[PDB]
Structures are given as structure tokens and as C-alpha cells.
Amino acid sequence: IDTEKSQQALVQKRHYLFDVQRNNIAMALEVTYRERLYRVYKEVKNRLDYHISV
Amino acid sequence: MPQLNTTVWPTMITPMLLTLFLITQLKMLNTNYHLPPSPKPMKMKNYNKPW
């Protein structure tokens, strides 16, 4: 009986795998978005700065 | 020797065959030794959780 109740406890804990997967998808998309914004900002500022430096 | 008087030989043979082949054997059949009460605490046809 104790073993079966413990098996039920693990089944209750199951959901963390899908929490992990959803966390990783959200975080990867956010990292990609912010890297893209930094890329566009850096290119624009870099060209303007080449002009100002010459 | 009274053991050689063959006139009382059935009187000595007939009850014996009842006592040796019927009554004592019916009383041994009712003398039974059950097998030990050995309780296995290891019996669980379980399986991993549904994954």
C-alpha cells in the first residue's frame, strides 16, 4: 500500500518536465528577440559612428 | 502350545485385519501436518509509472 501511494506521489510530481520544456521555449525566444534588437541597434550606431569618426 | 490350536485362528485374524488395515489407517489419515505458514513479504507484481 505504501509503495502504491508513493507511486501516486511521483505521478503527481510529473508535470515539471513540461514546465521545463515551456520555460526553455519561452526563454530561447526572448533571448533571440533581445539579441536581434541589440544587433539592429549596434549596426545603426556603428555606421553612424564610422561617419563621425572619419 | 495354545498358539498351535488352529480352531481360534480366525478369531485372531479377522479383527486384526480390521484394526491394521481400516481403523489405524483411518486414524493416521486424520493425522495431517500442514505446510509451514511462510509469509512472503516480497510479492508485488508492480510496474514503472506510466512513462
Side-chain angles (χ1 to χ4, degrees):
Chain A
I1 278 175
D2 290 354
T3 283
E4 284 287 343
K5 294 199 179 328
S6 299
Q7 304 290 102
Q8 290 174 184
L10 271 70
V11 160
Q12 197 67 26
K13 269 174 184 179
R14 181 62 165 165
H15 69 77
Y16 282 126
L17 183 76
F18 318 105
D19 262 344
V20 161
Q21 303 182 8
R22 282 187 294 239
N23 266 345
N24 283 11
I25 294 147
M27 292 205 302
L29 294 186
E30 262 318 298
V31 170
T32 287
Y33 190 47
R34 298 190 194 188
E35 289 197 35
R36 279 170 176 178
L37 280 193
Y38 282 163
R39 273 191 69 163
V40 65
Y41 161 76
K42 184 167 89 79
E43 308 298 4
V44 158
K45 197 196 197 180
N46 182 284
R47 278 176 202 240
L48 270 194
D49 275 4
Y50 164 81
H51 281 291
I52 208 170
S53 158
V54 61
Chain B
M1 312 289 285
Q3 288 92 319
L4 296 179
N5 172 18
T6 60
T7 300
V8 302
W9 271 28
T11 299
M12 303 291 168
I13 294 175
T14 301
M16 188 273 304
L17 304 160
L18 277 160
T19 305
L20 178 61
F21 288 97
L22 190 66
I23 302 176
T24 305
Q25 305 210 11
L26 279 174
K27 283 203 166 194
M28 290 298 116
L29 278 182
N30 213 37
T31 293
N32 282 116
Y33 307 97
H34 67 77
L35 277 65
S38 82
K40 293 179 179 179
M42 183 56 263
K43 184 51 213 63
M44 188 67 202
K45 179 213 180 42
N46 210 357
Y47 163 61
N48 173 46
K49 284 78 67 178
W51 61 69

